Coordinates of C-alpha atoms (C1' of nucleotides) in Angstrom, one line a residue:
Chain A
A26 CA 8.2 18.8 -18.4
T27 CA 9.8 19.9 -15.5
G28 CA 7.2 18.1 -13.3
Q29 CA 5.9 21.9 -12.5
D30 CA 2.4 20.9 -13.6
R31 CA 0.4 20.2 -10.5
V32 CA 0.5 21.3 -6.8
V33 CA 0.1 18.9 -4.3
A34 CA 0.1 18.9 -0.8
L35 CA 0.5 16.0 1.8
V36 CA -0.9 16.7 5.4
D37 CA 0.2 14.7 8.4
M38 CA -1.2 15.4 11.8
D39 CA 0.9 15.5 14.0
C40 CA 1.4 12.7 16.8
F41 CA -2.2 11.9 15.9
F42 CA -3.0 9.5 18.5
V43 CA -1.8 11.1 20.8
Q44 CA -3.7 14.7 20.0
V45 CA -6.9 12.9 20.1
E46 CA -6.1 11.6 23.7
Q47 CA -5.0 15.3 24.5
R48 CA -8.2 16.7 23.0
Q49 CA -10.2 14.4 25.6
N50 CA -8.3 14.9 28.4
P51 CA -7.3 18.4 29.2
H52 CA -4.6 17.3 31.8
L53 CA -2.1 15.5 29.1
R54 CA -2.0 18.7 26.9
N55 CA 1.5 20.5 26.5
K56 CA 3.2 17.4 28.4
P57 CA 5.6 14.7 27.6
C58 CA 2.6 11.8 26.6
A59 CA 2.4 8.6 24.9
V60 CA 0.3 6.4 23.3
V61 CA 0.3 2.9 24.4
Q62 CA -1.9 -0.5 23.8
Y63 CA -1.8 -3.2 26.5
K64 CA -0.2 -2.1 29.8
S65 CA 0.9 -6.0 31.0
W66 CA 3.7 -6.3 29.0
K67 CA 6.3 -4.3 30.0
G68 CA 4.0 -1.3 30.2
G69 CA 2.4 -1.6 26.8
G70 CA 4.1 -0.9 23.4
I71 CA 4.2 2.5 22.5
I72 CA 2.2 3.7 19.2
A73 CA 2.4 7.3 19.5
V74 CA 4.6 9.8 21.0
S75 CA 4.1 13.8 21.8
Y76 CA 7.0 16.3 20.8
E77 CA 7.3 16.9 24.5
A78 CA 8.4 13.3 24.8
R79 CA 10.2 12.7 21.9
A80 CA 12.8 15.3 23.5
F81 CA 13.4 13.0 26.0
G82 CA 14.4 10.1 23.4
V83 CA 11.0 8.2 24.0
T84 CA 10.3 6.6 20.5
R85 CA 7.6 4.3 18.9
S86 CA 8.1 0.8 19.2
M87 CA 9.3 1.3 22.5
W88 CA 8.1 -0.6 25.5
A89 CA 6.7 1.8 28.1
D90 CA 8.8 1.0 31.1
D91 CA 11.4 1.6 28.8
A92 CA 10.3 5.0 27.8
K93 CA 9.7 6.1 31.9
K94 CA 13.3 5.5 32.3
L95 CA 14.2 8.6 29.4
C96 CA 11.1 10.0 30.9
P97 CA 10.2 9.9 34.2
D98 CA 7.3 12.5 34.2
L99 CA 5.9 10.9 30.9
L100 CA 2.2 10.6 30.9
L101 CA 0.5 7.4 29.3
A102 CA -2.7 7.2 27.5
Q103 CA -4.2 3.6 26.8
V104 CA -5.9 2.5 23.8
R105 CA -9.5 1.4 24.3
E106 CA -9.4 -3.0 24.4
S107 CA -12.1 -4.6 23.3
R108 CA -12.9 -8.0 23.0
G109 CA -9.3 -8.9 23.9
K110 CA -7.8 -6.9 21.5
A111 CA -7.0 -3.0 20.5
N112 CA -9.6 -0.9 19.1
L113 CA -8.8 1.9 17.3
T114 CA -12.5 3.3 16.8
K115 CA -11.8 6.6 18.7
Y116 CA -8.9 7.2 16.1
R117 CA -10.8 6.6 12.9
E118 CA -13.7 8.3 14.0
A119 CA -11.3 11.4 14.6
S120 CA -9.9 10.9 11.6
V121 CA -13.3 11.0 9.4
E122 CA -13.3 14.6 11.1
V123 CA -10.2 15.9 9.8
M124 CA -10.9 14.1 6.2
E125 CA -14.1 15.9 5.6
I126 CA -12.9 19.5 6.7
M127 CA -10.0 18.6 4.0
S128 CA -12.5 17.7 1.7
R129 CA -14.4 21.2 1.1
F130 CA -10.8 22.9 0.0
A131 CA -10.1 20.3 -2.6
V132 CA -9.8 16.7 -3.6
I133 CA -8.4 14.2 -1.1
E134 CA -6.4 11.2 -1.2
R135 CA -6.3 9.0 2.1
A136 CA -2.9 7.5 2.7
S137 CA -3.5 6.6 6.3
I138 CA -5.4 7.4 9.0
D139 CA -3.2 10.4 9.9
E140 CA -2.3 11.6 6.9
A141 CA -3.8 13.1 3.4
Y142 CA -2.7 13.7 0.1
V143 CA -4.2 16.6 -1.6
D144 CA -4.2 17.8 -5.1
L145 CA -4.5 21.6 -5.7
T146 CA -4.0 22.4 -9.0
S147 CA -7.7 23.3 -10.0
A148 CA -7.8 25.0 -6.7
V149 CA -4.6 27.2 -7.0
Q150 CA -6.3 28.4 -10.8
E151 CA -9.4 29.5 -9.1
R152 CA -7.8 31.7 -6.7
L153 CA -5.2 33.0 -9.3
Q154 CA -8.4 34.2 -11.5
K155 CA -10.4 35.3 -8.4
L156 CA -7.5 37.3 -7.2
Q157 CA -6.0 38.7 -10.0
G158 CA -2.9 40.9 -9.7
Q159 CA -2.9 40.5 -6.1
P160 CA 0.7 40.4 -4.3
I161 CA 0.5 37.8 -1.5
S162 CA 1.5 39.5 1.8
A163 CA 3.9 37.6 4.3
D164 CA 0.4 37.5 6.6
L165 CA -0.9 34.7 4.7
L166 CA 1.9 32.2 5.3
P167 CA 2.3 32.5 9.3
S168 CA 3.9 29.3 9.6
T169 CA 5.2 28.4 6.0
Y170 CA 8.8 27.4 5.6
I171 CA 10.5 27.9 1.9
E172 CA 13.1 25.0 1.5
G173 CA 16.7 26.5 0.7
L174 CA 16.0 29.9 2.3
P175 CA 17.2 32.3 3.1
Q176 CA 19.9 32.2 0.9
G177 CA 23.1 34.6 0.7
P178 CA 23.3 37.6 3.4
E179 CA 17.6 37.7 13.9
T180 CA 19.0 34.8 11.8
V181 CA 19.9 33.1 15.5
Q182 CA 16.2 32.4 16.0
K183 CA 14.3 30.1 14.1
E184 CA 11.0 32.2 13.0
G185 CA 13.9 34.7 12.4
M186 CA 14.9 32.5 9.5
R187 CA 11.5 31.6 8.7
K188 CA 10.6 35.0 8.0
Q189 CA 13.6 35.7 6.0
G190 CA 13.5 33.0 4.1
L191 CA 9.7 34.0 3.3
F192 CA 10.6 37.3 2.8
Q193 CA 13.1 36.3 -0.1
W194 CA 10.7 34.1 -1.5
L195 CA 8.1 36.4 -2.0
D196 CA 10.3 39.5 -3.2
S197 CA 11.0 37.0 -5.7
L198 CA 7.5 36.6 -6.8
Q199 CA 6.8 40.4 -6.5
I200 CA 9.9 41.0 -8.8
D201 CA 8.7 38.4 -11.3
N202 CA 12.1 36.8 -10.7
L203 CA 10.1 33.5 -9.6
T204 CA 8.4 31.3 -12.3
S205 CA 4.6 30.7 -12.2
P206 CA 4.7 27.3 -11.1
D207 CA 6.7 28.8 -8.2
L208 CA 3.3 31.5 -8.1
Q209 CA 1.5 28.1 -8.1
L210 CA 3.0 26.4 -5.5
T211 CA 2.9 29.5 -3.0
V212 CA -1.1 30.2 -3.6
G213 CA -1.5 26.2 -3.1
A214 CA 0.6 27.4 0.3
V215 CA -1.9 29.7 1.2
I216 CA -4.7 27.4 0.6
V217 CA -3.1 24.8 2.5
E218 CA -2.5 27.6 5.6
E219 CA -6.3 27.9 5.3
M220 CA -7.0 24.1 5.1
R221 CA -5.2 23.7 8.1
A222 CA -6.6 26.5 10.1
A223 CA -9.8 25.3 9.6
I224 CA -8.8 21.9 10.9
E225 CA -7.5 23.1 14.3
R226 CA -10.4 25.6 14.7
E227 CA -13.3 22.7 13.7
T228 CA -11.4 19.9 15.3
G229 CA -8.4 21.2 17.6
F230 CA -6.0 19.4 16.1
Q231 CA -3.1 20.3 14.8
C232 CA -0.8 19.1 11.7
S233 CA 2.1 19.7 9.7
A234 CA 2.3 19.9 5.7
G235 CA 4.3 19.4 2.7
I236 CA 3.6 21.6 -0.7
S237 CA 4.9 20.6 -4.0
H238 CA 4.5 19.5 -7.3
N239 CA 4.2 15.7 -6.7
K240 CA 3.4 13.8 -3.9
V241 CA 7.0 12.2 -2.9
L242 CA 8.4 15.9 -2.8
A243 CA 5.5 17.0 -0.6
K244 CA 5.8 14.2 1.6
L245 CA 9.2 15.1 1.6
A246 CA 8.6 18.4 2.3
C247 CA 6.5 18.0 5.2
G248 CA 9.2 16.3 7.4
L249 CA 11.1 19.0 6.8
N250 CA 9.4 21.5 9.6
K251 CA 7.5 19.6 12.6
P252 CA 5.1 20.1 14.3
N253 CA 2.5 22.2 13.3
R254 CA 4.2 23.8 10.0
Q255 CA 3.9 23.6 6.6
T256 CA 7.1 23.6 4.2
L257 CA 6.7 24.6 0.5
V258 CA 9.5 22.5 -1.4
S259 CA 9.9 24.2 -5.0
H260 CA 11.2 22.4 -8.5
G261 CA 14.4 24.8 -8.1
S262 CA 15.4 23.5 -4.3
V263 CA 15.5 20.0 -5.5
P264 CA 19.1 19.8 -6.9
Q265 CA 20.6 21.6 -3.3
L266 CA 17.6 19.3 -1.3
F267 CA 18.9 16.1 -2.9
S268 CA 22.6 16.3 -2.8
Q269 CA 23.0 15.6 1.1
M270 CA 19.3 13.6 1.0
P271 CA 20.0 10.0 1.9
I272 CA 18.4 7.7 -0.2
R273 CA 16.1 6.1 2.6
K274 CA 14.4 9.6 2.8
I275 CA 12.6 9.2 -0.1
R276 CA 9.0 7.4 -0.3
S277 CA 9.5 3.9 -1.3
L278 CA 12.6 3.5 -1.3
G279 CA 13.0 2.9 2.8
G280 CA 13.3 -0.8 2.5
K281 CA 14.8 -3.5 0.0
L282 CA 14.7 -1.4 -3.3
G283 CA 17.1 1.6 -1.5
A284 CA 19.4 -0.3 0.0
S285 CA 19.7 -2.6 -3.4
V286 CA 20.2 0.9 -5.2
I287 CA 23.0 2.2 -2.4
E288 CA 24.6 -1.4 -2.5
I289 CA 24.6 -1.4 -6.1
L290 CA 25.3 2.1 -7.9
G291 CA 27.5 2.5 -4.1
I292 CA 25.8 5.9 -4.0
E293 CA 24.6 7.6 -0.4
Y294 CA 22.3 10.5 -1.6
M295 CA 19.2 10.8 -4.2
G296 CA 21.1 13.5 -6.5
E297 CA 23.7 11.0 -7.3
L298 CA 21.0 9.1 -9.0
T299 CA 21.5 11.7 -11.7
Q300 CA 24.7 10.5 -12.9
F301 CA 22.9 7.4 -14.5
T302 CA 21.3 7.0 -18.0
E303 CA 17.5 5.7 -17.7
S304 CA 18.6 2.5 -19.7
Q305 CA 21.4 1.8 -16.7
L306 CA 18.6 2.3 -14.1
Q307 CA 16.2 -0.1 -15.5
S308 CA 19.0 -2.4 -16.5
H309 CA 19.7 -2.5 -12.5
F310 CA 16.4 -1.9 -11.0
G311 CA 13.5 -3.0 -13.8
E312 CA 11.9 -0.9 -16.1
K313 CA 9.6 0.3 -13.6
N314 CA 11.3 1.3 -11.0
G315 CA 14.5 2.4 -13.5
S316 CA 12.0 5.2 -15.0
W317 CA 10.9 6.1 -11.8
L318 CA 14.5 6.6 -10.3
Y319 CA 15.4 8.5 -13.2
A320 CA 12.5 11.0 -12.9
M321 CA 12.3 11.1 -9.2
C322 CA 16.3 12.2 -8.6
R323 CA 15.6 15.4 -11.1
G324 CA 12.6 15.9 -8.7
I325 CA 9.7 14.4 -11.3
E326 CA 6.9 12.1 -9.7
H327 CA 3.5 11.4 -12.2
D328 CA 1.8 9.5 -9.7
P329 CA -1.5 11.1 -9.4
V330 CA -3.6 11.8 -6.1
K331 CA -6.5 9.1 -6.4
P332 CA -9.6 10.8 -5.6
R333 CA -10.4 8.5 -2.6
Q334 CA -11.3 9.4 1.1
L335 CA -12.4 5.8 2.2
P336 CA -10.4 2.9 2.7
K337 CA -10.6 -0.1 0.3
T338 CA -10.4 -2.8 2.8
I339 CA -11.5 -3.2 6.4
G340 CA -9.7 -5.3 8.6
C341 CA -8.6 -6.6 12.1
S342 CA -6.2 -8.8 13.5
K343 CA -4.2 -10.1 16.5
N344 CA -0.6 -11.2 17.1
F345 CA -0.1 -14.0 19.5
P346 CA 3.4 -13.5 19.9
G347 CA 5.6 -16.3 21.8
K348 CA 4.1 -18.3 24.8
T349 CA 0.7 -16.9 24.1
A350 CA 0.7 -18.7 20.6
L351 CA -2.8 -20.5 20.1
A352 CA -2.6 -24.7 20.3
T353 CA -6.0 -25.5 20.6
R354 CA -8.3 -25.8 18.0
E355 CA -11.0 -24.1 20.3
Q356 CA -8.6 -21.4 20.9
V357 CA -8.6 -20.7 17.6
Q358 CA -12.2 -20.5 16.7
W359 CA -12.9 -18.1 19.7
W360 CA -10.4 -15.7 18.7
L361 CA -11.9 -16.0 15.2
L362 CA -15.0 -15.2 16.5
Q363 CA -13.8 -12.1 18.4
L364 CA -12.5 -10.8 15.5
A365 CA -15.5 -11.6 13.2
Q366 CA -17.6 -9.9 15.9
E367 CA -15.5 -6.4 15.5
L368 CA -15.5 -6.5 11.8
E369 CA -19.3 -6.8 11.6
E370 CA -19.5 -4.0 13.7
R371 CA -17.2 -1.6 11.3
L372 CA -19.1 -3.5 8.0
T373 CA -22.5 -2.5 9.5
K374 CA -21.3 1.0 10.1
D375 CA -19.5 1.1 6.8
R376 CA -22.8 -0.1 5.1
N377 CA -24.8 2.7 6.7
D378 CA -22.5 5.7 6.1
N379 CA -20.7 5.1 3.1
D380 CA -23.3 3.1 1.0
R381 CA -21.3 0.2 0.2
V382 CA -21.0 -3.8 0.9
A383 CA -18.2 -6.0 0.9
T384 CA -18.2 -9.0 -1.2
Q385 CA -15.1 -11.1 -0.3
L386 CA -13.7 -12.1 2.9
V387 CA -9.8 -12.9 3.4
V388 CA -8.4 -15.0 6.0
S389 CA -4.8 -14.6 6.9
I390 CA -2.6 -16.5 9.4
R391 CA 0.9 -16.8 10.7
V392 CA 2.6 -20.0 12.6
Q393 CA 5.3 -20.2 15.1
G394 CA 8.9 -19.8 13.8
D395 CA 7.8 -18.1 10.4
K396 CA 9.8 -14.2 9.8
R397 CA 7.1 -13.3 7.5
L398 CA 4.3 -11.2 8.3
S399 CA 1.9 -13.7 7.0
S400 CA 2.6 -17.5 6.1
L401 CA -0.6 -17.8 4.5
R402 CA -3.6 -15.9 2.6
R403 CA -6.9 -17.6 2.1
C404 CA -10.2 -16.1 0.9
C405 CA -13.7 -16.9 0.7
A406 CA -17.1 -15.2 -0.4
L407 CA -18.4 -12.6 2.3
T408 CA -22.4 -13.0 1.8
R409 CA -23.5 -12.0 5.6
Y410 CA -22.4 -9.3 7.6
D411 CA -22.8 -11.9 10.3
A412 CA -19.9 -12.8 13.0
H413 CA -21.0 -16.1 13.3
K414 CA -21.1 -17.0 9.8
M415 CA -18.0 -15.1 8.8
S416 CA -15.9 -16.8 11.5
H417 CA -17.0 -20.1 10.8
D418 CA -16.2 -19.7 7.3
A419 CA -12.8 -18.2 8.3
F420 CA -12.5 -21.8 10.1
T421 CA -13.5 -23.9 7.4
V422 CA -10.8 -22.1 5.2
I423 CA -8.1 -22.5 7.1
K424 CA -8.6 -25.8 8.8
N425 CA -6.4 -28.0 6.4
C426 CA -3.4 -25.9 7.8
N427 CA -3.2 -27.7 10.8
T428 CA -0.7 -30.2 11.0
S429 CA -2.1 -32.9 13.2
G430 CA -4.3 -32.9 16.8
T431 CA -7.8 -31.1 18.6
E432 CA -4.2 -29.7 19.1
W433 CA -3.3 -27.1 16.6
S434 CA -0.1 -27.2 15.4
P435 CA 2.3 -25.3 14.7
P436 CA 0.9 -23.1 16.7
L437 CA -0.5 -20.1 15.3
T438 CA 1.2 -16.3 16.1
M439 CA -1.2 -14.3 14.4
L440 CA -4.8 -14.2 13.3
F441 CA -6.2 -11.6 10.5
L442 CA -9.4 -11.1 8.9
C443 CA -9.9 -9.0 6.2
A444 CA -13.2 -7.6 4.0
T445 CA -12.4 -6.7 0.6
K446 CA -14.1 -6.2 -3.0
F447 CA -16.8 -3.3 -1.8
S448 CA -19.6 -3.0 -3.9
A449 CA -21.9 0.3 -4.4
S450 CA -25.1 -0.2 -2.2
Chain B
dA17 C1' 7.4 -9.7 22.1
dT18 C1' 6.8 -3.9 18.4
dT19 C1' 1.2 -3.8 17.1
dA20 C1' -2.6 -3.2 14.4
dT21 C1' -3.5 -1.8 9.8
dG22 C1' -3.5 0.0 5.5
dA23 C1' -2.3 0.4 -0.4
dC24 C1' 0.6 -2.3 -4.0
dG25 C1' 2.9 -4.6 -7.2
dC26 C1' 4.8 -9.1 -8.9
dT27 C1' 3.6 -13.8 -10.5
Chain C
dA2 C1' -5.8 -16.7 -6.3
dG3 C1' -1.5 -16.0 -3.5
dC4 C1' 2.4 -14.0 -1.8
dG5 C1' 6.2 -10.2 -1.4
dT6 C1' 7.1 -4.6 -0.1
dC7 C1' 6.6 -0.8 2.3
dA8 C1' 4.4 2.5 5.6
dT9 C1' 2.7 4.5 10.3
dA10 C1' -0.4 4.9 14.7

DNA sequence: ATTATGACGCT
DNA sequence: AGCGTCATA
C-alpha cells in the first residue's frame, strides 16, 4: 500500500472564537480583534486572534495590555464569565452548528471545538459513480491549492499561482498522467469545497481544510494555506514537502518525542527519517512509535477517522495561580460547588440532547510548586446530576490530600471536575 | 500568572 | 485505577 487507499479531510475553523464574536457583533468584522478572558489581570489573556490582528504580531497566550502595544487599534471581545469562571457555552453551541452541517456530507470525527476530521472515501466513490467520465472544471475548486504546484515553466500574485497550479493538476488528471488516488483526492476536494460553502452559507463561519489520504497529511495540508482556503496534498507531493519540513510540524511530534527524534538521530526534517530502518526506529523510540515513524515519513498513516461527533468527557476547571491559591477549607468547598453547578447544567443538557448519562466523576487538583498540570487524580461514582452531591463527593475524595490545618496546605492552584464513562440513556 | 478543555497511551 | 503526553480555543 502507498497509503493512497483513503480520502481524508481536516477542517479547521479560522480563529473560531473570534468569528463567533464577529458574527454576533458586526462592528468587529474585518478588523484586528482578539478574544480574551478575565480583563483584570493585564487586560486578560488572549485565546483567539483574528488574521488582521496576527499581522501586527498579536499571538495567543499574550496579555491584552501587551497586544495593545503591538496593535493599538486592537478590538477585544470578552469570554462570558459565570460563577467566577470562564463560560464557553457560546463557542460550544456554535461548534455544534458547524458539526451538524459537516455531518450531512460524510462521517466526522470531532478533534476539538474548532476542528474535525472527515472520512470522504465512500462519498468520493458515489460522486465518481454518479458523475461518470465527466471532467472536473477549475470552477469547482475556487479556493483549492495543490501543494507543490505550479512547477517548471501572472505568477507574481498569489491567486495567479493558485490557478496555474490547479490547471497543471487538472490537465494531468484530464490527460490521465495522474493516478486514480489523485482523482479521488480531487473529487474529495470538490466535496470539501461544497461542505465549506454550506458551512459559510448556513452559519457565516469561514474555515480552512486539508485534503489527503490520512489524518496527519490532511492536518499538515490544512495549515499550508490560511485563512479560508483548502489545500490538496497528494502522495506524490510528500517527498519534496517532507524534505524541508521540520519534524515538530507533524502531528504528535511537536513535543518530547519529536525532540528526541531530532536529538537522537541528528536530523532536522521529516524526510530524513526514510534513511533509517524500521527496526532502527523501533529500537530508539519503541515498537509502536518506530512503526509509526517509518510509515509516516513515507506519507503513510493508518489511524482511522473515528465515527464520533460528541465529546467523550465533560469537564470544567479553574486555575488559582500564585497568590490566589486556595488556603481555606471553606474556599475549596465553594469553588467545587461552582464547578459542580456548571457541570450539572452541562450534564443535563447533554442528557436531553444526546440521550446519554455519565457514570463517573473525576477530581483533579494541583498544588503550589508543582510543574505538572495535575498533581493528583481521583474518581468517584456519579449517580445523581446534582451539584450539591457532586461537589460534596468531590471534596470527600480529596480531603485526605490536605497536609494540616481548617487551613488547607499546600494551597491549591487548580480544581478540576470531569464527567466520564457515558452510557446510552 | 498562559486559561480551560480535550483525547490518548502507559502501567 | 492513576499518571504523563500532546494539542488548541
